[PDB]
Amino acid sequence: INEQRALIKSAHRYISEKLEDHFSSEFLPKALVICGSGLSGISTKIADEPKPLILSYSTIPGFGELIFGYMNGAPVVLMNGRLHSYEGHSLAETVHPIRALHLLGSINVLIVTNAAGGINASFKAGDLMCVYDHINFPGLCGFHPLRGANFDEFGPRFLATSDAYDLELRKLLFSKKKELNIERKIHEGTYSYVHGPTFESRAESRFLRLAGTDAVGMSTVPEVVTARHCGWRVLALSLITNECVVDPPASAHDENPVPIQEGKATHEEVLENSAKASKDVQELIFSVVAEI
Amino acid sequence: DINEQRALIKSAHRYISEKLEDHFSSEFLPKALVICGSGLSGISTKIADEPKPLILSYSTIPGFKVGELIFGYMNGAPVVLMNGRLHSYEGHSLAETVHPIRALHLLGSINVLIVTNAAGGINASFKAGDLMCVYDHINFPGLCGFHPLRGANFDEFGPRFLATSDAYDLELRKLLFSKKKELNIERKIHEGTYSYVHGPTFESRAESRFLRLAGTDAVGMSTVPEVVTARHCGWRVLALSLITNECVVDPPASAHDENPVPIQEGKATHEEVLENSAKASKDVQELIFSVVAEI
Amino acid sequence: DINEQRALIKSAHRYISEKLEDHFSSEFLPKALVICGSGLSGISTKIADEPKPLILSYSTIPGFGELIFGYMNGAPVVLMNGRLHSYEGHSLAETVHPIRALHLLGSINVLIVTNAAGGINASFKAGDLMCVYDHINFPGLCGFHPLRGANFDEFGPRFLATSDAYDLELRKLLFSKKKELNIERKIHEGTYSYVHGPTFESRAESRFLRLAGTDAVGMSTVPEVVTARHCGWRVLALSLITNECVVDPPASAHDENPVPIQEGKATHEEVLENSAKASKDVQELIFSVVAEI
Ligand code: HPA
Ligand code: HPA
Ligand code: HPA
Numbered sequence A: 001i002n003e004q005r006a007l008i009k010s011a012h013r014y015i016s017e018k019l020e021d022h023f024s025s026e027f028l029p030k031a032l033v034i035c036g037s038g039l040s041g042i043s044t045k046i047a048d049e050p051k052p053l054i055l056s057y058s059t060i061p062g063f064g065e066l067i068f069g070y071m072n073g074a075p076v077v078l079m080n081g082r083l084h085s086y087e088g089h090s091l092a093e094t095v096h097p098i099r100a101l102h103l104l105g106s107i108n109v110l111i112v113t114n115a116a117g118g119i120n121a122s123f124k125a126g127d128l129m130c131v132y133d134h135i136n137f138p139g140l141c142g143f144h145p146l147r148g149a150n151f152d153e154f155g156p157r158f159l160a161t162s163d164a165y166d167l168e169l170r171k172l173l174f175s176k177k178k179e180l181n182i183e184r185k186i187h188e189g190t191y192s193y194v195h196g197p198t199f200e201s202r203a204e205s206r207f208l209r210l211a212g213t214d215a216v217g218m219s220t221v222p223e224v225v226t227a228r229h230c231g232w233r234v235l236a237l238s239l240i241t242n243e244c245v246v247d248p249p250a251s252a253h254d255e256n257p258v259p260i261q262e263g264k265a266t267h268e269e270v271l272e273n274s275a276k277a278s279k280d281v282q283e284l285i286f287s288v289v290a291e292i
Numbered sequence B: 001d002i003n004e005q006r007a008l009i010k011s012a013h014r015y016i017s018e019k020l021e022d023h024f025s026s027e028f029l030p031k032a033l034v035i036c037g038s039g040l041s042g043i044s045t046k047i048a049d050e051p052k053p054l055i056l057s058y059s060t061i062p063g064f065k066v067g068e069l070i071f072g073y074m075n076g077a078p079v080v081l082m083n084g085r086l087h088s089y090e091g092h093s094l095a096e097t098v099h100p101i102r103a104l105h106l107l108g109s110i111n112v113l114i115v116t117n118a119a120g121g122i123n124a125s126f127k128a129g130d131l132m133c134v135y136d137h138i139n140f141p142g143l144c145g146f147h148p149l150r151g152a153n154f155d156e157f158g159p160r161f162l163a164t165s166d167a168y169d170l171e172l173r174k175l176l177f178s179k180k181k182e183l184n185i186e187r188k189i190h191e192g193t194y195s196y197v198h199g200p201t202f203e204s205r206a207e208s209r210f211l212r213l214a215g216t217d218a219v220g221m222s223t224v225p226e227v228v229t230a231r232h233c234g235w236r237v238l239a240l241s242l243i244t245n246e247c248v249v250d251p252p253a254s255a256h257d258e259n260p261v262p263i264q265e266g267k268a269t270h271e272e273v274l275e276n277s278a279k280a281s282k283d284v285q286e287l288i289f290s291v292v293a294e295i
Numbered sequence C: 001d002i003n004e005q006r007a008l009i010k011s012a013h014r015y016i017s018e019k020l021e022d023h024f025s026s027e028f029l030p031k032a033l034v035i036c037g038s039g040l041s042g043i044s045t046k047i048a049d050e051p052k053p054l055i056l057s058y059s060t061i062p063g064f065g066e067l068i069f070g071y072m073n074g075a076p077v078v079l080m081n082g083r084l085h086s087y088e089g090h091s092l093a094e095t096v097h098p099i100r101a102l103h104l105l106g107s108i109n110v111l112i113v114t115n116a117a118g119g120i121n122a123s124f125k126a127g128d129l130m131c132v133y134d135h136i137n138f139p140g141l142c143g144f145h146p147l148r149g150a151n152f153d154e155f156g157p158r159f160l161a162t163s164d165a166y167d168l169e170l171r172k173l174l175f176s177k178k179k180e181l182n183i184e185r186k187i188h189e190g191t192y193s194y195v196h197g198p199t200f201e202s203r204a205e206s207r208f209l210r211l212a213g214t215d216a217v218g219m220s221t222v223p224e225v226v227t228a229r230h231c232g233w234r235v236l237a238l239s240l241i242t243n244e245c246v247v248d249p250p251a252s253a254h255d256e257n258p259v260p261i262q263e264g265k266a267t268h269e270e271v272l273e274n275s276a277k278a279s280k281d282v283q284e285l286i287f288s289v290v291a292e293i
Helices: A002-022 A091-102 A167-179 A202-210 A221-230 A267-290 B002-023 B094-105 B170-182 B205-213 B224-232 B270-292 C002-023 C092-103 C168-180 C203-212 C222-230 C268-290
Strands: A031-034 A053-056 A065-071 A074-080 A109-118 A128-136 A186-193 A215-217 A233-243 B032-036 B054-057 B068-074 B077-083 B112-121 B131-139 B189-196 B218-220 B236-246 C032-035 C054-057 C066-072 C075-081 C110-119 C129-137 C187-194 C216-218 C234-244
Touching: A002 A053, A002 A065, A002 A091, A031 A091, A031 A267, A065 A267, A074 A267, A091 A221, A109 A221, A109 A267, A128 A167, A128 A221, A128 A267, A128 B205, A167 A186, A167 A233, A167 A267, A186 A221, A186 A233, A202 C129, A202 C203, A215 A233, A221 A233, A233 A267, B002 B054, B002 B068, B002 B094, B032 B094, B032 B270, B094 B224, B112 B224, B112 B270, B131 B170, B131 B224, B131 B270, B131 C203, B170 B189, B170 B236, B170 B270, B189 B224, B189 B236, B218 B236, B224 B236, B236 B270, C002 C054, C002 C066, C002 C092, C032 C092, C032 C268, C092 C222, C110 C222, C110 C268, C129 C168, C129 C222, C129 C268, C168 C187, C168 C234, C168 C268, C187 C222, C187 C234, C216 C234, C222 C234, C234 C268
Parallel strands: A031 A074, A031 A109, A109 A233, A128 A186, A186 A215, B032 B077, B032 B112, B112 B236, B131 B189, B189 B218, C032 C075, C032 C110, C110 C234, C129 C187, C187 C216
Antiparallel strands: A053 A065, A065 A074, A109 A215, A128 A233, B054 B068, B068 B077, B112 B218, B131 B236, C054 C066, C066 C075, C110 C216, C129 C234
16 A cells, blocks of 8 residues: 555656746646546646646556646546556556545546446437446445555545435536536436446346346446545436347347347447547536536 | 465364364264354354253364354254354455364264354344344355355365255255244244345445345345365254344435434444344254254 | 466476377377266267277366366267366456367367356246357456456457357357257356356345346356357357346345245255256257367
C-alpha cells in the first residue's frame, strides 16, 4: 500500500505542477468526466480561452490523455482513455487516476458514461439509462477496488454503497434533458457490473434480469466505488447499445427454430449505437457541468 | 506450494503443541475452537483462572499473520479461543485466513467449531439486536473461485470433494436453542441462511435485494471459509450471527419523486455495527459459555 | 504474460505438429477435439488400429494426461484424456492452453466435451444426460474468466458473444443419433452452470442456482467452451447427471421429526458410480456423432 501511496503522490505532484505552469490563474477542477461511450468528442466543447491543457497518460506517473480546461464556464478534468478490468489490469491501476486527482482538492463530482446491454424488457437500443443503483458482482466475490489495506486518509474501511448515486445530480440531468428538449429516452435503473469480456449468454441475461438488473456493462462501478470512497458525488449515465438476448436458444426438437445467432451482440453494434447517441450525451453532459 | 503450506501448518502445530506441554500440568486437549467475532470480544474473560490459561499471540506462532489464541478451560471444558481473526478484504489469502484451523486440527482433539460474527439483516423480519443461528450458507466468492479449498487437496485432512449440504450440525443447533431457553434469554434467535460476501463495502440496495432474492437471511464478510475448512477437517460447526443492522433494500429515490427519501437515510455504518455488537455481547457470551460445557 | 502464453502455445504446437508428421505417413488434420471427461474415459478404445494412433503424454508437450491422435469412426480426431480443473489451482490460461495449442493445427472446427454434473432441475435424475444448449459462467461474471487479459487477436474478437455458444445442428445430430442408436436413457436439453468447486453445493447454493435458471451444475467445461468459441469452433457439450443436488431446506432445530441433514449428500463415490453406468451410452453416442461432424 505504501508504494501505491507513493505512486499517487508522484502523480499528483506531476499534475499540479503542470497546471500552475500552464494556467495564469490557479486551475481547480470541480468535476472529473470519464469520457466513455457517447463522450468521445466532448473535448471539442472545451473553451478556447483560457487555453486548455492536454497531458498524455504516458508522462503522468501511474497512468490516452487528461484534458484540463473550461467547459460551459466550468473548470473540469476529462479522462480520454480508461483501463478496463478485463484487460488484465488490477483494480488499483484502473482507479489510480481518481485517487491521484483527488489530491488536487477541488474535484467533488465524478461524471462517467459507458455502453451497456439492456436487460430491462422495456429498454431499446439507443435509449439511455441514468444509474441510480448498482450490483458489483466481481466485488461481492473478491474482485474489489477496496480490497487490501484501507487508504485511511481517503475514506472509511467499511464504505456504504446504498447512497452511491447522488439524487440531486440525477434531477439535474433530467432537468437538462427537458431544457434541451432532447427526445431520447432516459430511464432510471440498476446497473450491473460484470467482468466481461464476453457478452452475456441468454441464461446469464435471464439471471441478471431476475437479480434486478436493468442494464449490464463491463466497467464504471469500480470507479464509482472509489470516487465514493473519496467522498465524491457521482453521476453515471449508461448508453443502451444493444438489447440483451434472453429467450432460450432454439431447441433441437423445434420444427421451425429461431437461429441461435439471431440478434447476437457485436462490438460493431456497440460502436455504431454509441456514435448515434453521442451528440445527445455530449450536449446533456455539457449542460450539466455548468451547474455543478 | 501445498508443501510450503504444509510446512507452515506443521511448524505452527509444533510450536503450539510444545507450548501446551510446557504450560499445562496435565495434557491439554481442547474439544472446541471458538472464533470470537462480534459479541464475543469479552468471552476470554470467562476462561477459568485455574488452571492458568495459555495465551499465544499470532505474532509468536508460525504462519499466523495478524490477534491471539487462548487455551484454557471454559465451564469445565478445554477450549481454544481465537481473538482477532483475519479478513480477506484486508488482503489476506483464504489459505492464510484458515491456516489456524488446520494447525489446531493437528492437536487431534478438536471436533467442534463455534463461530460468531456480525451480519446485516436481509430477511425483512429481522431487526437490529436479533441473533441468527446459522443452518445453511451461500458461499458466493467460493462459487466464483475465491475458495479456501482451492489448490492441491490436503488429503491428510479431508476429501478432494467436500459436501456442504450438511455443514451446520443439527444437534448443536438444538443445544443452542435449549440453552437460550435455559438462560431465559428474551433476545430473538432466528434460524436461517448466511451469505458470505467479500466486502469491505456494505451492500447497495440492489445488492441486498439480490441477496434476499437468492435466499439470504443475513449477510456478512466472514466465517464461511472457516466453516468450510472446519468441515473439510471433519469438525462439527455451530455458527451464530449478530444482526447488527437492517440492510437497506428499497429502491433509492427517483429523480421524478416530488418528495424523495434521502438516499443516505438508514445507511449502514461501522459505528452502528460496533454499538450493536456491544449491546448483544452479554447474551451471546452467556449463550456460548453454556453451550461449550455440553460439547 | 500474454507473451509467455503465446510462447507456450507456439512451442506446444511445434512439438505436436512435428510428432504428427513423423508418426503418420499421411498428413493428419483432426476435425474435432474430444475432451474425454466423464462417461468418455474408455472411448480411446474405439480409435481405429489403422493407421496406428499417436499417444502424446502431457509431460512431453510444452505447457501441458495424454493426447491421442487417430481415426474414430472414419474421422480424424484428437482426444484429450486428462483435463486441468481450476479447483486444483491451475490458472484458466493453463486449463484452456490445449485448445489454443491445437487450434494452430488449423483443422479442428468442433469441440466435443463431456463432464459430470449435479442435477439442479428438480425433474432430473441421476443417470440422465443433458445436452447443453446454454450456460451460466458465474466465475466469469465475477472475474475468473478465460479471456481475461490482453486479447489473442490471432484467434478471435475482444468481445465474444455467447448467446450462440451451443451449435443447433450439432445438438440435432446428437438427438438424431440417440434415436438411431435406440438409447432409452433420457437426454435433457438445458442450462449448465459452471462453479469453481471443489465443494459440492449447499442446499441454499443449489436453491440459488435453481432460481438463477440452472438445470445442471458442474466444476468444469465452460471455460473450454468459451475458449473454443473464441477460436471460432462449434461446440457440442454433454453433461452426465451423476447425482441429484440436495435443495430442500435443512432440518430445523424446532422440528419434531427432522430429516437427517446428511441424507442423500453428494459424494465423489456416487459421481464415479453413475459416470460408469452411463459410459457405454455416452461413448456410443459420441462415436456415432463424430462420423458426421
Ligand atoms: O450486452 C452487453 N453486455 C455487457 N457489456 C456491454 N456493453 C455494451 N453492451 C453490453
Ligand atoms: O450490512 C452488512 N453487510 C455486510 N456485512 C455486515 N456486517 C454487519 N453488517 C453488515
Ligand atoms: O453436485 C454437483 N455439484 C458440482 N459439480 C458436480 N459434478 C458432479 N456432481 C456435482
